[PDB]
């Protein structure tokens, strides 16, 4: 009946853990300990984008590594020209509680959402000179927590109602629904091939989803608190996790277990955003201590520190070419960082 | 050059509109409606003048925004920081649910977690103890001891209502830096908007002195 189902569930969990331990011979630290250290990393603020009048929650870069889109609590979406600091667009929003924003790979659409539980897509290329809303994705019973663009017609939306969905643009219907989490999913990261994505939720677990069949591939655990940040390795065989505690974790898709732990005693605050470099060697993570830390992804050593914000760093990411890093924060400022 | 101007001029026009929007928003008052289980929330909404509901009403030339997040149905700790810096929080408690895991105890539990919140260290709290007409009839047949085992007073409405207010007012641990306003309202009460306007006046006074450095 109902009693033996739980018993076989624990047996299956034990077998999975035993399989994970069986395929664990040497950790990443032992293998990498022979290579040369990355050294100290120095980065300087090249551009300071001002104009937002509230806390900034979204940062997502553009595919051309020049155009930036940011969201804040004033109900305005501003498209930034990072090279010239000029504001390309200023999109007013019906609801000022937007938490995430997305930039389409083609650069023609921008999507945002928040406590309204609606993912609104805004057209940037129209005959008229204004930016108009194109679609309003409704059907989620929780706050919008992440949105990523696969192409001009498919968008994956993470919401606070514990479920993730894949939407269609020209028809406002949910193509597939992703279920299996027990807490609110706060972030999602797409693979380079646009075939899989990983979502981190508040149950200290991360799930790998397949877009086409709409079901969970693997489940990753190891964190102690809610997961707020996620980023996908350029390989596609790994991803990094940032939780509400002071620990960053790197997971392997093929090994299906924890690989390397990024933590320090002086850090007590949580992680809001996590991003990787072009080669996947530097792990950049924002923290609640008004500071950004650069981690050596292979040795867990703190390579450098980005201290240029007077408030919590909420959003962070790296350009497609990896030349510049743009950091957003609650102080209503955007900062672009480059090496000497 | 002859092409930097065109992009810069368009950019400069945006901050002109951004500054105007910010100035208009800075003159507005934001209110957080934070009742539990529809504890007379709809009654006070109509008495002033979907994930989150926005309500706008004008009183004494002051613009008010009320945000209702009762339909969110999610973990509060993941989005309650978005309301940091709000002018005040409006709390609605029905006095008639003391005879309904108890409905009253749930109200105090969420009140305690919200009043003693890191993002709401010094925010004003307006407590609305509504449904007082039904409370008077219920207290004449059902004692208050069903909800509060430690109650020692009689079943008179005046002291029973005061006892509930004292327990709610005793849940805050920062009485030296924040104040809770309690007002008993009913369906026919017409002074609710005046009470809210009076409560936010000191908040404006609070911010005015901070601007000139007195606080």
């Amino acid at each position, epitope marked *: 009946e109902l009693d033996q189902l739980r018993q076989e569930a624990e047996q299956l969990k034990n077998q999975i853990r035993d399989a994970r331990k069986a395929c664990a011979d040497a950790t990443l630290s032992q293998i990498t300990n022979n290579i040369d250290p990355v050294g100290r990393i120095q980065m300087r603020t090249r551009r300071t984008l001002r104009g937002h009048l509230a806390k900034i929650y979204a940062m997502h870069w553009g595919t051309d590594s020049r155009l930036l889109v940011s969201a804040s609590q004033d109900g305005k979406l501003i498209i930034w020209d990072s090279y010239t600091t000029n504001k*390309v667009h200023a999109i007013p929003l019906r609801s000022s509680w937007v938490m995430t924003c997305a930039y389409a790979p083609s650069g023609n659409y921008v999507a945002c959402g928040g406590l309204d539980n609606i993912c609104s897509i805004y057209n940037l290329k129209t*005959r*008229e*000179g*204004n930016v108009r809303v194109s679609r309003e994705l409704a059907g989620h019973t929780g706050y919008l927590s992440c949105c990523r663009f696969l192409d001009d017609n498919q968008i994956v939306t993470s919401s606070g109602d514990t479920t993730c969905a894949l939407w269609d643009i020209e028809t406002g219907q949910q193509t597939t629904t992703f279920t299996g989490h027990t807490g609110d999913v706060m972030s999602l990261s797409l693979a380079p091939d646009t075939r899989l994505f990983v979502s981190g939720a508040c149950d200290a677990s991360a799930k790998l989803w397949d877009v086409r069949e709409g079901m969970c591939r693997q489940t990753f655990t190891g964190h102690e608190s809610d997961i707020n940040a996620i980023c996908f390795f350029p390989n596609g065989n790994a991803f990094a996790t940032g939780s509400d505690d002071a620990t960053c974790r790197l997971f392997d898709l093929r090994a299906d277990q924890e690989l390397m732990t990024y933590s320090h005693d002086n850090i007590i605050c949580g992680i809001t955003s996590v991003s990787f470099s072009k080669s996947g060697r530097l792990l950049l993570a924002g923290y609640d201590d008004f500071n950004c830390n650069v981690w050596d992804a292979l040795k867990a050593d703190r390579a450098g520190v980005l201290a240029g914000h007077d408030n919590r760093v909420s959003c962070l990411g790296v350009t497609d070419d990896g030349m510049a890093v743009a950091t957003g924060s609650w102080d209503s400022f955007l900062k672009i960082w480059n090496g000497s | *050059s*002859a*092409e930097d*101007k*065109a*992009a810069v*001029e*368009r950019s400069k*026009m945006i901050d002109r509109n951004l500054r105007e929007d910010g100035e208009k928003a800075a003159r507005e008052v934001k209110l957080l409606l934070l009742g539990a289980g529809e504890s007379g929330k709809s009654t006070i909404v109509k008495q002033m003048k979907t994930g989150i509901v926005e309500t706008h009403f004008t009183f004494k030339d002051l613009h008010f925004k009320m945000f209702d997040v009762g339909g969110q149905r999610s973990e509060r700790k993941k989005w309650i920081h978005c309301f940091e810096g709000v002018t005040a929080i409006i709390f609605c408690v029905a006095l008639s649910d003391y005879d309904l895991m108890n409905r009253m105890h749930e109200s105090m539990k969420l009140f305690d977690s919200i009043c003693n919140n890191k993002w709401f260290t010094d925010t004003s709290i307006i407590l609305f103890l509504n449904k007082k007409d039904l409370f008077e009839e219920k207290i004449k047949k059902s004692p208050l001891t069903i909800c509060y085992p430690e109650y020692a007073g009689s079943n008179t409405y005046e002291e029973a209502a005061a006892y509930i207010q004292c327990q709610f007012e005793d849940l805050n641990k920062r009485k030296d830096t924040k104040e809770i306003y309690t007002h008993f309202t009913c369906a026919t009460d017409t002074k609710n908007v005046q009470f809210v306007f009076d409560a936010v006046t000191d908040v404006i006074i609070k911010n005015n002195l901070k601007d000139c450095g007195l606080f």
Partner: single-chain antibody
Amino acid sequence: DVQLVESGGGLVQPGGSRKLSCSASGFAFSSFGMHWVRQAPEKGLEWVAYISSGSGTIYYADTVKGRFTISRDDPKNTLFLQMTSLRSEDTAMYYCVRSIYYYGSSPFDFWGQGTTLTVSSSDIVMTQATSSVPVTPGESVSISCRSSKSLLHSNGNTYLYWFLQRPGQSPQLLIYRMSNLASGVPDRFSGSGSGTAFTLTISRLEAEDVGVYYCMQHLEYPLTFGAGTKLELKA
């Protein structure tokens, strides 16, 4: 449906005054800058005046400075061009062209129908190829362009624009910044160049490609149009 209707033209005595009204409908006129371009009878295009989106920046051609003034009415979506001391050389077809910061440039995508004005009585030089070339459908055409000054800028943008004026129709933008295809233009057209020499190539010819092709630089203001190359079908 973007529309720009021009009205207020007719016979004018020399030394008189007139005003041109360009009504805008179907687009955000407030955020669009406006240009005035006239075409003399059996001649080429020439820029007259430009007004910014916020009216802060206003420029005039050297041949119309002082006599001509330009104004816009954003609430009524109407563009004005007041004229004083009209000469016999001002007889042309005036076009109001919308222009906004688009795709990292300032395109001239939409042109008005035009109005008839009859008056009875340092600049970059763009040199065009032979004014007439005989072509037949199915072939590939190559139109050249030469600039006195290098249109390549320090930011990597070469500000060269290509237009097609069909017989009896207003000019239409084809190529902006020498490399980008405008919206609604077939992929047959292509643009290439380096510094001062530019080439526009049509891969597959069609009967709808008949017209005069114009090149204008947006490097300095002071926008100058080429003589124009006319494409005619062989008999």
